[PDB]
Amino acid sequence: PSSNGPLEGTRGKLKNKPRDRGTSPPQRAVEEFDDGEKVHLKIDPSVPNGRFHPRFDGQTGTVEGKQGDAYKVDIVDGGKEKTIIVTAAHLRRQE
Amino acid sequence: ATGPRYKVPMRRRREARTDYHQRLRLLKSGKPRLVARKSNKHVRAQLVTLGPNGDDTLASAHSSDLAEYGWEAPTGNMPSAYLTGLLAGLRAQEAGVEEAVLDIGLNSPTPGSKVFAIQEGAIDAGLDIPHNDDVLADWQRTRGAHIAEYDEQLEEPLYSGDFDAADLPEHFDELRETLLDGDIEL
Amino acid sequence: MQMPRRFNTYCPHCNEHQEHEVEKVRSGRQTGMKWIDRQRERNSGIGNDGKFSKVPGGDKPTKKTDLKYRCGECGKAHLREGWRAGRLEFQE
Amino acid sequence: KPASMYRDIDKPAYTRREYITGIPGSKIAQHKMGRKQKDADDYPVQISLIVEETVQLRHGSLEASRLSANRHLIKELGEEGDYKMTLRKFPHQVLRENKDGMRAAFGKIVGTAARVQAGEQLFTAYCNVEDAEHVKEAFRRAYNKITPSCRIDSSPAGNA
Amino acid sequence: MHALVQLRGEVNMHTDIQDTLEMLNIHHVNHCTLVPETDAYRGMVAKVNDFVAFGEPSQETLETVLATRAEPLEGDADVDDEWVAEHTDYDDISGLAFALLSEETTLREQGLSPTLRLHPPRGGHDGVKHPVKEGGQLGKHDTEGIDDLLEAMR
RNA sequence: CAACC
RNA sequence: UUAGGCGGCCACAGCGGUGGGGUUGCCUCCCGUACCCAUCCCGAACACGGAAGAUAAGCCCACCAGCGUUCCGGGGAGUACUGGAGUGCGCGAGCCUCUGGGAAACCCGGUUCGCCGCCACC
RNA sequence: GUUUGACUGGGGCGGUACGCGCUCGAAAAGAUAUCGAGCGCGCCCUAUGGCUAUCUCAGCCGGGGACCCGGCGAAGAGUGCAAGAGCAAAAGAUAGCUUGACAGUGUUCUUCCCAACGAGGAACGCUGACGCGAAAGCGUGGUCUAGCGAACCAAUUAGCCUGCUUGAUGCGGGCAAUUGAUGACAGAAAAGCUACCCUAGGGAUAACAGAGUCGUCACUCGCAAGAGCACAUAUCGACCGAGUGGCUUGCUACCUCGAUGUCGGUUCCCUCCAUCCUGCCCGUGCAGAAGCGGGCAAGGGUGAGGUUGUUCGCCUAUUA
RNA sequence: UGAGGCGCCCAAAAUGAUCGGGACUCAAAUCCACCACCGAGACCUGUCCGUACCACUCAUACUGGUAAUCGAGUAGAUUGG
RNA sequence: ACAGCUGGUUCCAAUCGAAACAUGUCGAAGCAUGACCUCCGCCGAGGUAGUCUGUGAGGUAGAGCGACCGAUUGGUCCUGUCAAACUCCAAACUUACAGACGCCGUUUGACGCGGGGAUUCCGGUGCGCGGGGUAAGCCUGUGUACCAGGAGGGGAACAACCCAGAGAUAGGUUAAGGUCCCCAAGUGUGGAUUAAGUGUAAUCCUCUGAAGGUGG
Ligand SMILES: [Cl-]
Ligand SMILES: [Cl-]
Ligand SMILES: [Cl-]
Ligand SMILES: [Cl-]
Ligand SMILES: [Cl-]
Ligand SMILES: [Cl-]
Ligand SMILES: [K+]
Ligand SMILES: [K+]
Ligand SMILES: [Mg+2]
Ligand SMILES: [Mg+2]
Ligand SMILES: [Mg+2]
Ligand SMILES: [Mg+2]
Ligand SMILES: [Mg+2]
Ligand SMILES: [Mg+2]
Ligand SMILES: [Mg+2]
Ligand SMILES: [Mg+2]
Ligand SMILES: [Mg+2]
Ligand SMILES: [Mg+2]
Ligand SMILES: [Mg+2]
Ligand SMILES: [Mg+2]
Ligand SMILES: [Mg+2]
Ligand SMILES: [Mg+2]
Ligand SMILES: [Mg+2]
Ligand SMILES: [Mg+2]
Ligand SMILES: [Mg+2]
Ligand SMILES: [Mg+2]
Ligand SMILES: [Mg+2]
Ligand SMILES: [Mg+2]
Ligand SMILES: [Mg+2]
Ligand SMILES: [Mg+2]
Ligand SMILES: [Mg+2]
Ligand SMILES: [Mg+2]
Ligand code: NA
Ligand code: NA
Ligand code: NA
Ligand code: NA
Ligand code: NA
Ligand code: NA
Ligand code: NA
Ligand code: NA
Ligand code: NA
Ligand code: NA
Ligand code: NA
Ligand code: NA
Ligand code: NA
Ligand code: NA
Ligand code: NA
Ligand code: NA
Ligand code: NA
Ligand code: NA
Ligand code: NA
Ligand code: NA
Ligand code: NA
Ligand SMILES: [Sr+2]
Ligand SMILES: [Sr+2]
Ligand SMILES: [Sr+2]
Ligand SMILES: [Sr+2]
Ligand SMILES: [Sr+2]
Ligand SMILES: [Sr+2]
Ligand SMILES: [Sr+2]
Ligand SMILES: [Sr+2]
Ligand SMILES: [Sr+2]
Ligand SMILES: [Sr+2]
Ligand SMILES: [Sr+2]
Ligand SMILES: [Sr+2]
Ligand SMILES: [Sr+2]
Ligand SMILES: [Sr+2]
Ligand SMILES: [Sr+2]
Ligand SMILES: [Sr+2]
Ligand SMILES: [Sr+2]
Ligand SMILES: [Sr+2]
Ligand SMILES: [Sr+2]
Ligand SMILES: [Sr+2]
Ligand SMILES: [Sr+2]
Ligand SMILES: [Sr+2]
Ligand SMILES: [Sr+2]
Ligand SMILES: [Sr+2]
Ligand SMILES: [Sr+2]
Ligand SMILES: [Sr+2]
């Protein structure tokens, strides 16, 4: 890459398909998840805050608690364990 | 409508019925919502909770079923609104609901209005709802005094159908008196 | 940029919000009696004097704000992080 | 410059004019020849020159092959003969040349070419049964001025 | 039930392809194994298609190979009808062959090594640079084709 | 053209 | 749901169009500014108070496909492209065979003029 | 007495790909290079920050390129600055109010994929004190990704700890943190010449030559516009297209730096043919003589002189 | 008049020509099929060795057992002689 | 004297077996910290190199643009073309998590954890995908297998092309490749084409042969 900021090369993954453009439905931004639950991580282009590092888009982690209204989700980046702080708006239950 | 790339607003947005930005902020409380609404002739109060396939109304009261307890007056005024809230509130307490946040939909936060009267009603019913006293109409107006004095400037009865000539806020009292009572069939 | 001479903000001393007056930190005069001053005299002799032969460094294109925030009631000041500002003029 | 330098599709598509400046003008004078006021449907015969290999054809080559082809048609049918020929491809691919050894080698812009897949029609003519052999001859001269071997394919024409 | 025989060595073959063979219990050239026809196993053979020969053998062929190359989980003990009867849920090789082909059991389940260590093909095979349809020995074979191979390697 | 420009 | 409120999905719901529906019921349009409240000027709106009138808007009900959208059949197409393999072909750029996957445009015929959840209600 | 850096299709010169951000390169998870393509940042802003209320923008049309009215108009506007991305009862506009651009202390991620590493950054908490709002709630600066700096030292902020037997005063030492810069940007205080040179090594790296390449150069072929008084092809021959050679030049850095002596000439030997003469032919815009062009053909020949170190070339008299 | 196969022209280089050479023409060439063979340290098989593990054992001493799923190796780590 | 530079450093065997890369560095002929190799100790039941299925991530190939965007023809709706920094579409495929099967681990203790010792930070080649360059046995990426550090068989010779991964010794059968002689095996069978010694040349710096032409 020519630069190394957090959004380097995120044109596609952080862009909305035209029809999904615009403020997102509040339901998923308020969804509640329980510890142990499997949740897919996917940033919602329309939602500014509560995001995780774009590099983690597509991970399926495990909720292990929360910090304020955000969730602490455990993942394994390659071989290393990491805890991700992320709000419901960027999460989806697995299955 | 124009083409593949065209963006159509969410249905409740087209219909101009749901303010999604206010809704989200409302839902962030984690508490149920005291949905206060109005019609030209009626006033409705619902205690709504979030659900998997949509909202869930746990309790509610309409100004119409107010007569069901001895109401012969119109159903689109302050006294009606307050009592309707209280009724809904009481029923809310029945179903186990103890707290709520006022959702006034697309209505304006005008001081002394009816959605605020509905709130004062629901609060007296025993429901804990974040509010602000100096935004609620003064007691007398809730009773319906403002309308009695309006009938003072008579010459021609304010109410077409005969409910009375000089109207009665004292009736408001009898009804609230009846609602705060235990017996009452909710 | 412009900066209000006085404004309401948190006073970590009163532990409550109060009016403060903002002032640029004026350099205090040295005494020439600090340990470094004596080391300079003790270690400078014939020839090069190591660190005491080095001269003043350069300058950053822009400096960060350097202000004092004085509480309008208890009279005590506190410091804050500064932010790069080409110029800082006060209003009133 | 030899065509061996650019005839192959061995580089990314380089056509974005918003990021490329100093692009030389095309040498192609016309893409529609003959009586262009008339429709191709008004003719009983349609013959195309098909490219047999995938290649890049520099605008200098298109002009020469088109020229030597239309020129023949004009000589054999007249400056206003009853026919119409079309060059359907345009030189969208920008070409470079590195003209300092291999250091900072990205070349300066020197021309344009059209990419043609094998089997595609480069030229297509429409004529009457009479001037059918005249167009087949105009094409024989045209494929002699472009890299690949070509097929002179006759579409509508059962007058054999 | 398909019979799998590795015909191309490990040198230069993709590691994921090589690990697949090993999971199918084949660790040497000419080694053969029997695999049930499941969606899971199907992907595995499809992935190793270019380095093996496979197909469904006939009852008679399986019986010939089992008699000649079947081995105990441990030991040199011969595997004959008597061994089969005294150690498996069958009375003789045939009973075993049938149960295998009908996928009701596995060599391991009956105390036998999952692998049949065949002999090089008598008279040579059709070549390991082309598939069957092109005259080679690689890929899915005919029951008659697989039988010709398995018998030449008895 | 045989180093440096 | 003989017309209501809060929604979930967020065009299969859009755009456009036709037909039908309401004496003390519902939603409205509607009537009206003493009050609470309101217009940088307007009771237009917001807000309050109310029933003389109306089903013409809205709304709800039934429906039409011309445009847009969703899915499906048949054709394009097992084509384009492609993971694995090859002492197969080609001067070469490149192509082919076997194995496992597999579009897009477009055309023709259907589908689609919302589905679902909670509450309330002749 | 020393320093005078690093990168680099050898070095110098030129440049900075030496710290940051965006698109593409990048091959649909992540990561990914070149002196790769396009281009930015070292700020600016007391509002251009924050909240609330009211509200909807470009552009086009119709009625009285400023203003007023209506219609269409999901976004092409606006949002400080690159690029890409986000945003419409708003994240934009207007109005009003306000100072959360706040103090303390963490969690996590990033910096640095995987996988250790500082400053810096972000998201998300708890505590304190506040702003606005009916309230939910929003505010840890500007919608998101650039706008940044170690130790030592100084100045500064509030309280406290401490200085050699002891008390007082002076003046010091310290805990926490803010500001001052190192852009060679994970931080030395720093100019050149050497042909008088020296050492260590390198074919890890240039010059001659070799080798690869063949853009360049040489030669050939295809097509044949054109002219040749008429006539493409006696002859000359543009454009474009396809090749062969390895004589020039360029490129690469494969071989050799414990050395393969460097231009020109000379002398002596072998060879190639794309043939200058000689032999034999074909055509002619072939009367002859002689030209011009072409074919086979490498047996033999291809010489002497003037300037110049010259190669080449220019010049002279001879010559088949 | 269309298409396919093989070949021909296009086709010039330096000490001595070349498909490795000889040499080959209903082939010892090319294409389509087929038959039988040759040919590794691979694979199968006998015996032995090392190493790992197992049983027995104080033993890492003997004896017995298992290895389809053990046996190549530069820098380097480890251990017995 | 010092050197980060060249040279050298002496007995046998057994187990395992790299890195030629990332971050920082007055650093690029060096180091440190990681990655990776190895040894020891702790832990005690799972693990996941393969495949299938389910729940997700993705915009490359292709395609297309009366779907944006910007290029790009002509005529009096039609008609002619495109995109590394375009997208109404959209693969193969790569990838997170889980279940199933497979394989493996519970005396061979896997997975994980702590500690000792390194070496290494000039790489190269093939194939696929690339970016630069007319090109190169070119430069610079990426994934993978190989050489390096890999024998033996074949390929005339020939680091990385084919077979093949190998304890000793012995018998046997094949692999690649080959069967006229040199040289082990056919002057094999059915059939057809070629007259040029075309050809007897998988791959390749290495094996050329093109546009164009041909009543062979
Ligand atoms: Cl994160
Ligand atoms: Cl309402
Ligand atoms: Cl300042
Ligand atoms: Cl020993
Ligand atoms: Cl091995
Ligand atoms: Cl010969
Ligand atoms: K020199
Ligand atoms: K040298
Ligand atoms: Mg992309
Ligand atoms: Mg065994
Ligand atoms: Mg063979
Ligand atoms: Mg009507
Ligand atoms: Mg070839
Ligand atoms: Mg010194
Ligand atoms: Mg240097
Ligand atoms: Mg990627
Ligand atoms: Mg210093
Ligand atoms: Mg200071
Ligand atoms: Mg640095
Ligand atoms: Mg850095
Ligand atoms: Mg020296
Ligand atoms: Mg070299
Ligand atoms: Mg010598
Ligand atoms: Mg000649
Ligand atoms: Mg001679
Ligand atoms: Mg044999
Ligand atoms: Mg040893
Ligand atoms: Mg030993
Ligand atoms: Mg494409
Ligand atoms: Mg080595
Ligand atoms: Mg012999
Ligand atoms: Mg030959
Ligand atoms: Na959205
Ligand atoms: Na001293
Ligand atoms: Na340069
Ligand atoms: Na109506
Ligand atoms: Na320096
Ligand atoms: Na940090
Ligand atoms: Na050269
Ligand atoms: Na050449
Ligand atoms: Na000389
Ligand atoms: Na001669
Ligand atoms: Na001379
Ligand atoms: Na070793
Ligand atoms: Na030194
Ligand atoms: Na390296
Ligand atoms: Na380095
Ligand atoms: Na060094
Ligand atoms: Na398992
Ligand atoms: Na492709
Ligand atoms: Na290896
Ligand atoms: Na050999
Ligand atoms: Na020959
Ligand atoms: Sr001193
Ligand atoms: Sr001094
Ligand atoms: Sr400066
Ligand atoms: Sr290229
Ligand atoms: Sr051609
Ligand atoms: Sr009115
Ligand atoms: Sr060629
Ligand atoms: Sr299929
Ligand atoms: Sr000096
Ligand atoms: Sr140079
Ligand atoms: Sr923000
Ligand atoms: Sr100077
Ligand atoms: Sr001199
Ligand atoms: Sr030497
Ligand atoms: Sr000759
Ligand atoms: Sr002559
Ligand atoms: Sr000269
Ligand atoms: Sr060994
Ligand atoms: Sr070994
Ligand atoms: Sr090993
Ligand atoms: Sr990829
Ligand atoms: Sr024969
Ligand atoms: Sr024959
Ligand atoms: Sr060579
Ligand atoms: Sr070749
Ligand atoms: Sr040809």
mmCIF file of N, CA, C and O in Angstrom, chain B residues 67-94:
data_model
loop_
_atom_site.group_PDB
_atom_site.id
_atom_site.type_symbol
_atom_site.label_atom_id
_atom_site.label_comp_id
_atom_site.label_asym_id
_atom_site.label_seq_id
_atom_site.Cartn_x
_atom_site.Cartn_y
_atom_site.Cartn_z
ATOM 1 N N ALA B 67 -65.528 6.198 28.532
ATOM 2 C CA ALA B 67 -66.957 6.241 28.837
ATOM 3 C C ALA B 67 -67.341 4.970 29.583
ATOM 4 O O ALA B 67 -68.251 4.957 30.416
ATOM 5 N N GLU B 68 -66.628 3.898 29.265
ATOM 6 C CA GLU B 68 -66.839 2.597 29.874
ATOM 7 C C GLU B 68 -66.762 2.680 31.406
ATOM 8 O O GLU B 68 -67.019 1.698 32.096
ATOM 9 N N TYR B 69 -66.414 3.854 31.932
ATOM 10 C CA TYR B 69 -66.315 4.048 33.381
ATOM 11 C C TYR B 69 -67.115 5.258 33.856
ATOM 12 O O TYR B 69 -66.988 5.687 35.008
ATOM 13 N N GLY B 70 -67.929 5.815 32.965
ATOM 14 C CA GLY B 70 -68.746 6.961 33.326
ATOM 15 C C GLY B 70 -68.294 8.280 32.733
ATOM 16 O O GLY B 70 -68.216 9.288 33.437
ATOM 17 N N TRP B 71 -67.994 8.275 31.438
ATOM 18 C CA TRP B 71 -67.551 9.479 30.750
ATOM 19 C C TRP B 71 -68.558 9.789 29.652
ATOM 20 O O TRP B 71 -68.784 8.972 28.756
ATOM 21 N N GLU B 72 -69.171 10.964 29.727
ATOM 22 C CA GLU B 72 -70.160 11.362 28.733
ATOM 23 C C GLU B 72 -69.713 12.603 27.961
ATOM 24 O O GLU B 72 -70.435 13.102 27.095
ATOM 25 N N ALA B 73 -68.515 13.090 28.273
ATOM 26 C CA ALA B 73 -67.965 14.278 27.620
ATOM 27 C C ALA B 73 -67.194 13.937 26.343
ATOM 28 O O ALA B 73 -66.966 12.764 26.035
ATOM 29 N N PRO B 74 -66.798 14.967 25.572
ATOM 30 C CA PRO B 74 -66.048 14.738 24.334
ATOM 31 C C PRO B 74 -64.753 14.008 24.682
ATOM 32 O O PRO B 74 -64.338 14.005 25.839
ATOM 33 N N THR B 75 -64.108 13.404 23.690
ATOM 34 C CA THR B 75 -62.883 12.648 23.947
ATOM 35 C C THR B 75 -61.637 13.160 23.224
ATOM 36 O O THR B 75 -60.770 12.372 22.834
ATOM 37 N N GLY B 76 -61.537 14.473 23.056
ATOM 38 C CA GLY B 76 -60.381 15.033 22.377
ATOM 39 C C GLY B 76 -59.849 16.273 23.060
ATOM 40 O O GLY B 76 -59.424 17.218 22.397
ATOM 41 N N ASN B 77 -59.869 16.266 24.388
ATOM 42 C CA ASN B 77 -59.397 17.401 25.164
ATOM 43 C C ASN B 77 -58.430 16.995 26.272
ATOM 44 O O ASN B 77 -58.117 15.815 26.446
ATOM 45 N N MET B 78 -57.966 17.986 27.024
ATOM 46 C CA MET B 78 -57.018 17.751 28.101
ATOM 47 C C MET B 78 -57.453 16.729 29.147
ATOM 48 O O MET B 78 -56.721 15.779 29.420
ATOM 49 N N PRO B 79 -58.643 16.909 29.750
ATOM 50 C CA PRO B 79 -59.132 15.966 30.768
ATOM 51 C C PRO B 79 -59.139 14.536 30.231
ATOM 52 O O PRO B 79 -58.719 13.597 30.903
ATOM 53 N N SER B 80 -59.623 14.399 29.004
ATOM 54 C CA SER B 80 -59.694 13.120 28.321
ATOM 55 C C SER B 80 -58.295 12.506 28.192
ATOM 56 O O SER B 80 -58.089 11.333 28.512
ATOM 57 N N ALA B 81 -57.341 13.315 27.730
ATOM 58 C CA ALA B 81 -55.958 12.878 27.543
ATOM 59 C C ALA B 81 -55.316 12.393 28.840
ATOM 60 O O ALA B 81 -54.754 11.299 28.885
ATOM 61 N N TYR B 82 -55.388 13.207 29.888
ATOM 62 C CA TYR B 82 -54.817 12.826 31.176
ATOM 63 C C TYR B 82 -55.395 11.482 31.626
ATOM 64 O O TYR B 82 -54.656 10.524 31.851
ATOM 65 N N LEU B 83 -56.720 11.420 31.747
ATOM 66 C CA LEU B 83 -57.409 10.202 32.176
ATOM 67 C C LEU B 83 -57.056 8.986 31.316
ATOM 68 O O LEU B 83 -56.903 7.879 31.830
ATOM 69 N N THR B 84 -56.933 9.188 30.007
ATOM 70 C CA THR B 84 -56.585 8.090 29.114
ATOM 71 C C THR B 84 -55.192 7.551 29.446
ATOM 72 O O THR B 84 -54.949 6.344 29.378
ATOM 73 N N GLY B 85 -54.279 8.450 29.809
ATOM 74 C CA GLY B 85 -52.933 8.030 30.154
ATOM 75 C C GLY B 85 -52.970 7.209 31.427
ATOM 76 O O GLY B 85 -52.435 6.099 31.485
ATOM 77 N N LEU B 86 -53.618 7.772 32.444
ATOM 78 C CA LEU B 86 -53.773 7.140 33.749
ATOM 79 C C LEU B 86 -54.365 5.739 33.622
ATOM 80 O O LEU B 86 -53.927 4.797 34.290
ATOM 81 N N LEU B 87 -55.373 5.614 32.765
ATOM 82 C CA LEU B 87 -56.016 4.333 32.547
ATOM 83 C C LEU B 87 -54.970 3.373 31.995
ATOM 84 O O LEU B 87 -54.779 2.276 32.527
ATOM 85 N N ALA B 88 -54.284 3.795 30.933
ATOM 86 C CA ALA B 88 -53.243 2.972 30.318
ATOM 87 C C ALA B 88 -52.167 2.657 31.351
ATOM 88 O O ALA B 88 -51.704 1.523 31.450
ATOM 89 N N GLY B 89 -51.776 3.668 32.120
ATOM 90 C CA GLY B 89 -50.775 3.467 33.148
ATOM 91 C C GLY B 89 -51.207 2.376 34.108
ATOM 92 O O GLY B 89 -50.498 1.387 34.291
ATOM 93 N N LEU B 90 -52.372 2.549 34.724
ATOM 94 C CA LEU B 90 -52.899 1.552 35.658
ATOM 95 C C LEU B 90 -52.825 0.144 35.083
ATOM 96 O O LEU B 90 -52.391 -0.792 35.757
ATOM 97 N N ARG B 91 -53.258 -0.003 33.836
ATOM 98 C CA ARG B 91 -53.224 -1.301 33.178
ATOM 99 C C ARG B 91 -51.775 -1.758 33.017
ATOM 100 O O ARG B 91 -51.476 -2.953 33.094
ATOM 101 N N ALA B 92 -50.877 -0.801 32.796
ATOM 102 C CA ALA B 92 -49.460 -1.109 32.634
ATOM 103 C C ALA B 92 -48.949 -1.754 33.917
ATOM 104 O O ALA B 92 -48.289 -2.792 33.883
ATOM 105 N N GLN B 93 -49.269 -1.127 35.043
ATOM 106 C CA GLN B 93 -48.877 -1.624 36.354
ATOM 107 C C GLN B 93 -49.415 -3.039 36.556
ATOM 108 O O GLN B 93 -48.773 -3.883 37.186
ATOM 109 N N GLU B 94 -50.602 -3.290 36.014
ATOM 110 C CA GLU B 94 -51.226 -4.602 36.130
ATOM 111 C C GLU B 94 -50.389 -5.686 35.464
ATOM 112 O O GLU B 94 -50.173 -6.754 36.040
#
